[PDB]
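Homework-ish question, so no full write-ups if that breaks the rules, but can someone show me the predicted structure for this set?
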Amino acid sequence: NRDAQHALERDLEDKNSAEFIDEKCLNLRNTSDCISFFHGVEKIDGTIS
Amino acid sequence: CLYQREKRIGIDLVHDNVEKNLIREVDMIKCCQEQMRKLAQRIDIQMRD
Amino acid sequence: VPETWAKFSNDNIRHSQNMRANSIRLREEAQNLFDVLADQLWRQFTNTN
Amino acid sequence: DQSNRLQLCGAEASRLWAGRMTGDSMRLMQDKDQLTRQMQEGTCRNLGQ
Amino acid sequence: KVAQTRLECRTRRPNVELCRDSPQFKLVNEVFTIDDTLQTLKLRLRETR
Amino acid sequence: DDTLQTLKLRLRETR
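A: Not a homework solution, just the prediction itself:
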């Protein structure tokens, strides 16, 4: 049971980090600061899941 | 609510997630008003121009 | 002065269009600030709850 | 007479060409602005989902 | 700039959460389309000059 | 030029 709890809470913290990334991307606007250019668009398509 | 934390007596008189959440909320609201006021001053300068 | 029809500058118009574009940028900035600041305040409020 | 007619005809050719170019130029601007705005808000809604 | 800053921060997702979803498709789509938009705009600017 | 953009759209979608 403790091992299964560890697996569940692993997946919880992964989902929470994905949350934080998702709201930080949603908050971004045109006039918002901390924004910059990034030539690396064609390499973001490499994922796993 | 932060003033209502104070009359708590005993071993409960500690700082928790709720305390730092309230501090973060207070600082966020102060920064809210500061950003709005600076933007209004910029609008004033533009209107003069 | 030739006869003041051989002219193609009247720079007051250009300056005024520059100020109009700058004011449009300021208005868009204020609208974006409204939206993101209200959304951030809700997120912090529900986290504290 | 040929020189005078050629100069006047060249002036009116430049007339019609620049007038048609200026008339056509604004629709491209408007359509590109609308396309950019709509696709950005579609991206934001997809992020929300 | 909005597109590329959204794209860069979403590649730092954790391991199982690095997900190729429809927002990735929309961001890549928007980068390519705004590049083509920019290109035809400078071509028209050169013609008008 | 817009039909080329539509064809690129459909290419990426089908891929």
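Now go work out the reasoning yourself. Hint: The first helix of chain E runs from residue 2 to 9.
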